[PDB]
Each structure stands twice: as structure tokens, then as C-alpha cells.
Design a protein that fits this description.
Four copies of one chain form a homotetramer.
Chain A: H1 3-18, H2 23-40, H3 56-80, H4 84-93, H5 95-105
Helix pairs in contact in A: 1-2, 2-3, 3-4, 3-5
The complex binds protoporphyrin IX containing FE (HEM) (4 copies) and zinc ion (6 copies).
Residues 3-4, 7-8, 10-11, 14, 45-46, 61, 64-65, 68, 94, 97-98, 101-102, 105-106 of chain A line the site of one protoporphyrin IX containing FE (HEM).
Function (chains A, B, C, D): Electron-transport protein of unknown function.
GO molecular function, one term (chains A, B, C, D): electron transfer activity
GO biological process, one term (chains A, B, C, D): electron transport chain
């Protein structure tokens, strides 16, 4: 999917996590976020169109999706324990990774 | 040291990282931050004085220092590679862990 | 590719890493291992044919591939620093993750 | 305590974990291993007596204790979920970190 449509599924499943009532629903939504991030990993953002795929801005942009995937995985451990409320809080914290990359490249 | 004096050394070495010129100076300051966090790990904050050491607020408060120590360690890998500028950026990102705990417990 | 062919590329590239002479060759071989491990992540092993895709043996089997990939990624940082020898040593340690999963499921 | 006595508590508590019957006993033994590993973090091994405290053998030696501690911590999450058997299995995998460091420095 294009970059805009991956961002949208990331933004929508964050909201779905806030309002969830059980672990299977948190699990479902985090899984969808992981696949969206993995698909986004290979795109070129508009603000970087004139750069080389080997350029440190592109390398840094890629790596931000690898950290996000790492944080979603750790949230997935807390849903499998039954510790649902912590899982929901770790999910909200993910905004930090979102904003840090938005500041440089959105 | 008391909680206030550990916070102060954490706050001061963040500023020292911004303005550093080489790897040995970033290394030095991150090391100091790690020891301050490890010393803070066992304190009771004012807003939690009436709670049991086994209580989920205390357990959650402790765990926030374990994540911070984990992030400082990863910043230390980037200073040892010579990749000084990335190390400085990972350091700024640490504010997220700072604020998230401040929101609940400062 | 099938599970057998993925295991064979994993096994072959371990040997190529032992005998390498520069960082580009370590990098090339590690990259091929990551892609083999990502494809294998979605297979069903023979000894598990009679189980459900949601069953804790399957979920654990998947999870062994994620750890493998995380350790291959850290080895890739060591090759990009020019620290070739340390990279080679981190590659030999991967055997622990290979053997653990073979013990339960090969 | 000295390095030898720390290794002996590490070795003893591995055996206690094998033979445990409930989560409180796994928890107790893992906790004693973490503290042994934290004390050992600042020792100098005999085979390294002639080296500088800033020397890459010493820095690598220290780093093996940090990884050990990180793997003991994750095992502690598994005991607190009530997933006792998985905890026991994660404890047996620690041998990989024990052996790797023995190969270079014992
Ligand atoms: C859960 C985390 C994230 C959320 C919820 C999120 C959300 C969004 C949203 C709602 C947009 C607006 C898209 C539109 O115009 O319809 C956007 C754009 C964008 N995001 Fe994210 N984002 C996240 C993480 C990231 C990360 C980690 C990166 C980089 C590594 C990133 C890079 C970008 C870029 C470059 C755009 C501009 C796209 C364009 O204008 O075509 N985002 N994001
Ligand atoms: C690098 C990260 C951090 C920085 C730079 C920082 C900075 C500060 C500063 C400047 C203060 C004001 C202290 C004063 O009154 O003189 C403070 C207070 C406090 N911080 Fe942090 N902090 C950090 C991380 C954390 C974390 C991770 C936690 C919890 C896990 C935390 C918990 C608190 C609490 C409870 C107070 C209130 C202390 C009191 O009023 O006695 N902080 N911090
Ligand atoms: C660098 C790491 C690894 C190496 C070098 C490796 C090597 C091998 C080799 C040589 C085989 C024999 C294939 C054949 O019959 O031709 C095999 C099979 C197998 N491996 Fe691995 N392996 C690795 C990691 C893993 C991991 C992480 C898992 C599980 C998460 C795994 C699961 C299996 C299974 C289930 C088989 C049996 C396949 C069958 O009989 O069809 N392996 N592996
Ligand atoms: C659960 C993990 C470990 C176990 C069970 C273990 C066990 C042992 C044992 C039984 C000894 C023999 C002590 C004696 O002579 O009485 C020993 C020595 C030693 N261990 Fe470990 N070990 C572990 C982890 C580590 C790690 C992570 C390191 C390094 C980072 C390490 C470094 C050493 C060294 C240097 C010695 C030699 C000490 C001397 O000769 O005085 N060990 N260990
Ligand atoms: Zn990385
Ligand atoms: Zn995991
Ligand atoms: Zn933890
Ligand atoms: Zn490390
Ligand atoms: Zn496939
Ligand atoms: Zn001591």
C-alpha cells in the first residue's frame, strides 16, 4: 500500500487500542500495526524524493520503522500475559516514535 | 543520593550531551546518567508515600527506571562506533521516557 | 522457498561468514540469512502438522525466527562500524538460537 | 563476594531452577542470580590481570554480565505471568551466555 494508507492504518489501530475490552482485540490491532510498519519500511517520503537510497537520511528513515516494530513486539508480550492495561499504556507511549520521525521527515 | 539530586544529575548530563564535541564526552555523561537511574530505582516518590512496596504503582514506577537504563545502554553502543551525531539524537529522544513517568508520578 | 531450502541457505551462510575477508562479504551473507529467516517465519514444520495455527507450539516456533532476526540485525551494526572480527563472533553465537529450536521441533 | 563465590551462586541456582515446584521458588532463585551477576560486573578475572580497566577485553567482559542480567530479567516476567515451565526453559538457555564468556576468559 502507499505511504499515506499505511500511516492511516497505524493511526486507526491506535484508537482501536484505547477502546478495547479484551486481549484478543489488542492482539489483533497490534498485529495489523506491525504489518503496516513492515510494508512502509521500503517507501520514499515526499520530503526526501531527491536523495539517494544509500543516503543517511534514508538510512535513518528506515531505522525508525525497525524501532517501532521493536516496540510493538514488546507490547505484544504484555497482551499475551493477560496484563491488558499495561499493554494499552505501552501502546500510547508509541506516539514518541511517531512524532520523532514526523519532526524530521513529515 | 535522594531522589531530587538524582533527577538533577540526569537533567544536567542531558544538557552536557547536546553541547559535546567528541565520543569520550558523550560516553562520560551517559555513564553518569546510568548510575543515577540505578540509584533512583529504589526510592519512594512523594505522591506515592501511602502505598505498599508491592503495589502496582510502585512496581510500575520501578520498571520505568529499567527502560531508561535500557535506552541509555543503546545510546552507548552508538558512541562506541564513533557515530557521535546519532548518539546525540538518541539522547534527546530519552525525554519521552522522562515525561511519561512525570505525567503519572511527578 | 520451502523450509528445507531456507535452512540450507542459513547453514551455508554461517560457513561463508567464518571464512570472510572484508565487511562487504559479511554484510552480503548476513543479509541473505535475514531474508531466509523472514520467509521461514510463516512455514509449518512436519513435527507440527497436526496443530492449529493459533496453537502455543506454532506461536513459539514463529517467535524463535523473530529472535534470530534481531540477533542478525545487531551483527549488521558491527559490520557497518568496521568491527569485522566482533561481527564474525556474534555470527557464531547464533548457533544457540538454531539449536534451541531444533531441540523442540526438528 | 569474590568472583569464584559469585560463579558458585550462579551455578547452584541454575540447578535449583531445574528442580523447582512453584513460581515463588523460581522467582527467589532468579533474584539471587541477578545480584550475583551485578556484583561480578566490577571484578578483574585472573586471565586479564595485566590489562587496563579501559581495555576492550575488560569492556567486553563487563558487557557479558549486562546481557546475562537482561536475560534473567525477561525470565522474571515469565514467572510473574504464572508461565512457570517457559521460565524454566528460558533459564536453561542462559548457558549460552555462560559458555561464550568462559571460552574467551575463563
Ligand atoms: C504509530 C505511529 C504513527 C502514526 C500513528 C502515524 C500517523 C501519521 C498520519 C495520520 C499521517 C498523515 C498521512 C495523511 O496525509 O493522510 C502521517 C504521515 C507521515 N508519517 Fe507517520 N505515523 C506514525 C509513525 C511514523 C514513523 C515511525 C515514521 C518514520 C519512520 C513516519 C513517517 C511519516 C511520513 C514521512 C509522513 C508523510 C507522508 C506523506 O505526506 O505522504 N510516521 N503519519
Ligand atoms: C533523563 C530523564 C529524566 C530527567 C532529565 C528528569 C528530570 C527531573 C527534574 C529536573 C525534576 C525536578 C526535581 C526538583 O524538584 O529539583 C524531576 C522530578 C521527578 N522525576 Fe524525573 N527526570 C527524568 C526521568 C524520570 C523517570 C524515568 C522517572 C520515573 C520512573 C522520574 C520521576 C520523577 C519524580 C517522581 C519526580 C518528583 C521528585 C520530587 O518531587 O521529590 N523521572 N525529574
Ligand atoms: C542459523 C540458524 C539455523 C541453522 C544453521 C539451521 C540449520 C538447519 C539444517 C541444516 C536443517 C536440516 C535441513 C535438511 O534436512 O536439509 C534444519 C532443519 C530444520 N530447522 Fe533449522 N537451522 C537454523 C535455525 C532454525 C530455527 C531458528 C528454527 C525454528 C524457529 C529452525 C527449525 C528447523 C526445523 C523445524 C527443521 C526440520 C525441517 C524438516 O525436517 O523439513 N531452524 N535446520
Ligand atoms: C549462569 C551463568 C554462569 C555460570 C553457571 C558460571 C559458572 C562458573 C563456574 C562453576 C566457575 C568455576 C569457579 C570455580 O573455580 O570455583 C566459573 C568461573 C568463571 N566465570 Fe563463570 N559462570 C557463568 C557466567 C559467566 C559470565 C557471563 C562470565 C563473563 C562475563 C563468566 C566468567 C567467568 C570467569 C572469568 C571465571 C574464572 C574465575 C577464576 O578462575 O577465578 N562466567 N563460572
Ligand atoms: Zn538497529
Ligand atoms: Zn519476544
Ligand atoms: Zn521488564
Ligand atoms: Zn549491549
Ligand atoms: Zn514464502
Ligand atoms: Zn562487590
Amino acid at each position: 500500500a502507499d505511504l499515506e494508507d499505511n500511516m492511516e492504518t497505524l493511526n486507526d489501530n491506535l484508537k482501536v487500542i484505547e477502546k478495547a475490552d479484551n486481549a484478543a482485540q489488542v492482539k489483533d490491532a497490534l498485529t495489523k500495526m506491525a504489518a503496516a510498519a513492515a510494508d512502509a519500511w521500503s517507501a520514499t517520503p515526499p520530503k526526501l524524493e531527491d536523495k539517494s537510497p544509500d543516503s543517511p537520511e534514508m538510512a535513518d528513515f528506515r531505522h525508525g520503522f525497525w524501532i517501532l516494530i521493536g516496540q510493538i513486539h514488546a507490547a505484544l508480550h504484555l497482551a499475551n500475559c493477560g496484563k491488558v492495561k499495561e499493554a494499552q499504556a505501552a501502546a500510547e507511549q508509541l506516539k514518541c516514535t511517531c512524532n520523532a520521525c514526523h519532526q524530521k521527515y513529515r
